[PDB]
Amino acid sequence: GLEAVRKRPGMYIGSTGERGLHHLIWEVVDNAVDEAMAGHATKVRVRLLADGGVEVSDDGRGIPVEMGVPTVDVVMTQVGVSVVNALSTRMEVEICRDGYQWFQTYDKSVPGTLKQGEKTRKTGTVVRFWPDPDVFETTTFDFETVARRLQEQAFLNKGLTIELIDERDGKHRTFYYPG
Amino acid sequence: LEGLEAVRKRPGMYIGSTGERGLHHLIWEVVDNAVDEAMAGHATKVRVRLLADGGVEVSDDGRGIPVEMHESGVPTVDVVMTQVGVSVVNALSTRMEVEICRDGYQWFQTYDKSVPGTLKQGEKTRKTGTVVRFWPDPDVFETTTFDFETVARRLQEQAFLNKGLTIELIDERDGKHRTFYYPG
Ligand SMILES: CO[C@@H]1[C@@H](OC(N)=O)[C@@H](O)[C@H](Oc2ccc3c(O)c(NC(=O)c4ccc(O)c(CC=C(C)C)c4)c(=O)oc3c2C)OC1(C)C
Ligand SMILES: CO[C@@H]1[C@@H](OC(N)=O)[C@@H](O)[C@H](Oc2ccc3c(O)c(NC(=O)c4ccc(O)c(CC=C(C)C)c4)c(=O)oc3c2C)OC1(C)C
Ligand SMILES: [Zn+2]
Ligand SMILES: [Zn+2]
Ligand SMILES: [Zn+2]
Ligand SMILES: [Zn+2]
Ligand SMILES: [Zn+2]
Ligand SMILES: [Zn+2]
C-alpha cells in the first residue's frame, strides 16, 4: 500500500531531496492540467503557501464522488497522487461535482469522512497538501522550477490559463497561449 | 496482474486520457526515471530515441534498476515494472524491454502484455545504467505518434534542472536530433 512508498520513497519519486519534493507538485499540477483536454477546464491556479503547503485548483470535471467507498478515497490511496498523500502530513480535497461542493481530509494518508456541502453549479477540484518534513531534506518549493513547468503546460494546452501565486513573497505569474 | 488490469480498465485515472497527452505520460515517466539518476545515481547522460516503429528507448548511465531478489521472491526489476510509476507504461504497452548494467553484469528482461519474462544474466561489465524500451498499445491510445517538439521541450527543462547532465534526443522516424546540456 502507501506503507511501501514511505519505506522506499526513491522507488516512487527518485529521491527525498528537492527533486523528490518537486515530484509532488509536478503530479498534482499534471492531474489538474489533464482536465483541459479531458474535462473542458479553462483555468488552473497553483499557490505556494508560506507554511510549505501547496494548493492546486482547477475548473475541470471534479474527482468523481459517487460510491461503498467514495472514488476520491480510491484516487488518493491508489493512483499517482496517492504518492503525494503517502509523503504528506495531511491533504485537503475540495470537489465541485454533481451540483454540490464536497470536502475530504487525509491525516497521514488516512481518509476522513467525505462531507457534502453547499449546492453549486461550479465543477472542479482543489488539492492542498503539506509535504512531510521528516521525509524531505528540503521542503522549499522553487518558484522558477514551478514556473518553468507551468509555462510548458500552458504551451501544450492552448487556451488554458495557469496562474502561479507565491504566498511567501506575493510574486505571481500568469501563463497563457491562445489557440 | 490485478493492479495492471486496473490501469487497462480505467486508464484516465492513471494518465488523464487516451489521446496524445495520455500517450506522452508514458515517455514523461520513463524520461523522468532516467533523469532522476543524475541527482541520485551519478548519471552523466540520458539518451531518448523515438523508434521508427512507434516505440521509445530511454538509456542512462545511472545505478541500474536493482536486479537482486526482492522480499516478494522475484527480481526487484519485476517489482518496479509491475508496481511503481513505470508499471503504468508496462500496463499500456504491448511489450517492454529492460537492459540493466549493475552488480558487475549486464541483465535483460522482457514484458509481454506486462507479463515478466525470465531475467537473463549476460556478460560482465564495469558499467552501470538502465535502458528501457516500450511500445504503446494502439488498442489503448487514439494516437501512437510521439511529438518531437513536445519531447524536446521536456528534455530542455530536465537538462536545465540537472546542470552537467547531457540529454540526447534522436528521432529515428526522420533523423532529427537535439543535444541538451547546461554547464555547472
Ligand atoms: C487527482 O484526481 C485526478 C484528476 O485530477 C483533477 N485535478 O481533476 C484528473 O487528473 C483525472 O480525473 C478524471 C479521470 C477520469 C474521469 C472519468 O473517467 C470520468 N467519467 C465517468 O463517467 C466516471 C464517473 C465515476 C467514476 O467513478 C469513474 C471512474 C472510472 C473510470 C475512469 C472508468 C468515471 C469522470 O467523470 O471524471 C474523470 C476524472 C475527473 O484523474 C484523477 C481522478 C485521478
Ligand atoms: C524505473 O526504475 C526507476 C529508476 O529508473 C532508472 N532509469 O534508473 C530510477 O528512477 C529509480 O532508481 C532507483 C531507486 C532507488 C534506488 C535505491 O534505493 C538504491 N539503494 C540500494 O542500496 C538498494 C538496493 C536494492 C534495492 O532493492 C533497493 C530498493 C529498490 C528499488 C529502489 C527499486 C535499494 C539503489 O542502489 O538504486 C536505486 C535506484 C536505481 O527508481 C526506479 C527503480 C523506480
Ligand atoms: Zn522521478
Ligand atoms: Zn538543486
Ligand atoms: Zn465534454
Ligand atoms: Zn496526468
Ligand atoms: Zn552515490
Ligand atoms: Zn556511482
Residue numbers in the entry:
A (entry chain B): 22 to 88, 92 to 102, 123 to 213, 245 to 254
B (entry chain A): 20 to 102, 123 to 213, 245 to 254
Give the original sentences from the paper that presented this experimental model:
We have investigated gyrase from M. thermoresistibile and found it to be more stable than the M. tuberculosis enzyme. Based on these findings, we successfully co-crystallized a 21 kDa N-terminal sub-domain of M. thermoresistibile GyrB (residues 20–254 with residues 103–122 and 214–244 excluded) with novobiocin and Redx03863. This N-terminal sub-domain had been previously used to determine the novobiocin-binding site in gyrase from other organisms.
Gyrase is a type II topoisomerase and the only enzyme that can catalyse the introduction of negative supercoils into DNA;3,5 it is composed of two subunits, GyrA and GyrB, which form an A2B2 complex in the active enzyme. Gyrase is an essential enzyme in bacteria and has been extensively studied as a target for antibacterial agents;6 gyrase has been described as an effective drug target for the development of new anti-TB agents. Other compounds, such as the aminocoumarins (e.g. novobiocin), inhibit gyrase through targeting the ATPase domains of gyrase and topo IV, located in the N-terminal domain of GyrB (and ParE), thus preventing supercoiling. In addition, we present crystal structures of the GyrB N-terminal ATPase sub-domain from Mycobacterium thermoresistibile bound to one of these compounds (Redx03863) and also to novobiocin, demonstrating that this novel compound class inhibits via a binding pocket and resistance mechanism different from that of novobiocin.
